[PDB]
Amino acid sequence: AQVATVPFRLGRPEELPGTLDELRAAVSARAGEAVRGLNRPGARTDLAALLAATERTRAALAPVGAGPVGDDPSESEANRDNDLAFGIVRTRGPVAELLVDAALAALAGILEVAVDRGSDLEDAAWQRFIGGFDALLGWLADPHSAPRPATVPGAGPAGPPVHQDALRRWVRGHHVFMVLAQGCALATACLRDSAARGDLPGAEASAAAAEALMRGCQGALLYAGDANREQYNEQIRPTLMPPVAPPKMSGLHWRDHEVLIKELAGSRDAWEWLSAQGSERPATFRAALAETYDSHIGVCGHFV
């Protein structure tokens, strides 16, 4: 029931670029347009203006998809069920440019609900949540530099409850998860590659992206946890019809998360090297990491 704009098109995370130079060649032109679109005059006056700017930005971008991937021998049935439960369609085309499109669409998905009906999220959570998109697109626009944050308009307070708005937020929040998971996997991969090649500035820029994306993921988890609590209250009503359970991500079978955690493993030496070279990113990333891990409680079905 208009829970989210679907299909939600996303590339295969196994094809994400793995170096800063490759990433820049793949996406920096398009990401730069996206950033300029989201920071155009007037875009940041209020949440309604940001939504309008988002929709004008994504309309102004030339499409890049080539329709569904279709037959993918690397995709298990459990992967497919994971994606279908949230309306995800794996789509052929330049994976990093598809990530830019997906980021803009997930942003618009969030802002549609917040513009109409507010948010109960703490302003600092809202800031890091929506700030996750600025971090991602700003870094993709210039991967060799740390992304700089921009202003994020606040949301009004939650309005009157509308039927299954919690499910809309739950589903649209998971679309954000998939964008941030791919973004953080990119950032972690580039950190690993940069450090292996002794590119300390590239490593530092990659780690700065990874931390900002990780803080964005913590905001998204708070957002989804807030929706999940409201969902649980809405399930107290017993139903004569067979009860409809909200979609749930698997973990084992969610490909973007699998790719992310594999990159994070084996980024350990790069984080220690950055520390030894006098970076402050490792310490603050470690904090963001612990906070994001804890905020799984109340969102992911294999926690709590």
Task: Classify each residue of 141-150 as buried b or exposed e, where b means 16 or more C-beta atoms within 10 Å of its C-beta.
Answer: bbbbebbeeb
The total number of residues written for the chain in this structure: 304
Cα-atom radius of gyration of the chain, to the nearest Å?
19
Residue 265 near ligand HEC by CB under 6 A: yes
Of 113-121, 136-144, 243-251, 270-278, the segment contacting ligand HEC by CB under 6 A is 243-251
Of 2-10, 109-117, 156-164, 296-304, the segment contacting ligand HEC by CB under 6 A is 296-304
Report the residue from 257, 258, 259, 271 that binds ligand HEC according to the rule CB under 6 A.
257
Gap between the Cα atoms of 211 and 215, Å rounded: 6
Gap between the Cα atoms of 206 and 281, Å rounded: 10
Residue 299 near ligand HEC by CB under 6 A: yes
Compute the least distance from the CB of residue 60 to ligand HEC, in Å.
27
CB atoms within 10 A of CB 262: 13
Residue 139 near ligand HEC by CB under 6 A: no
Is 147 within 8 Å of 212 (Cβ atoms)?
yes
Residue 255 near ligand HEC by CB under 6 A: no
The answer to whether 298 is annotated as binding is yes
Residue 50 near ligand HEC by CB under 6 A: no
Residue 107 near ligand HEC by CB under 6 A: no
Residue 251 near ligand HEC by CB under 6 A: yes
The one-letter amino acid at 99 = L
Residue 302 near ligand HEC by CB under 6 A: yes
Gap between the Cα atoms of 301 and 193, Å rounded: 33
The answer to whether 297 is annotated as binding is yes
Report the residue from 249, 270, 274, 288 that binds ligand HEC according to the rule CB under 6 A.
249
Compute the least distance from the CB of residue 250 to ligand HEC, in Å.
6
Question: Residue 122: phi, psi to the nearest 5?
Answer: -60, 145
What beta strand segments (E) does 177-239 contain? Answer: none
Gap between the Cα atoms of 171 and 150, Å rounded: 26
Residue 167 near ligand HEC by CB under 6 A: no
Closer residue to ligand HEC in complex, CB, 58/175: 175
Is 234 within 8 Å of 164 (Cβ atoms)?
yes
The answer to whether 296 is annotated as binding is yes
Please tell me whether residue 39 adopts helix, strand or coil conformation: coil
Closer residue to ligand HEC in complex, CB, 129/254: 254
Of 59-67, 111-119, 161-169, 261-269, the segment contacting ligand HEC by CB under 6 A is 261-269
Please tell me whether residue 301 adopts helix, strand or coil conformation: coil
Residues within the interface to ligand HEC (CB under 6 A): 177, 180-181, 184, 217, 220, 249-251, 254, 257, 261, 264-265, 289, 292-293, 296, 299-302
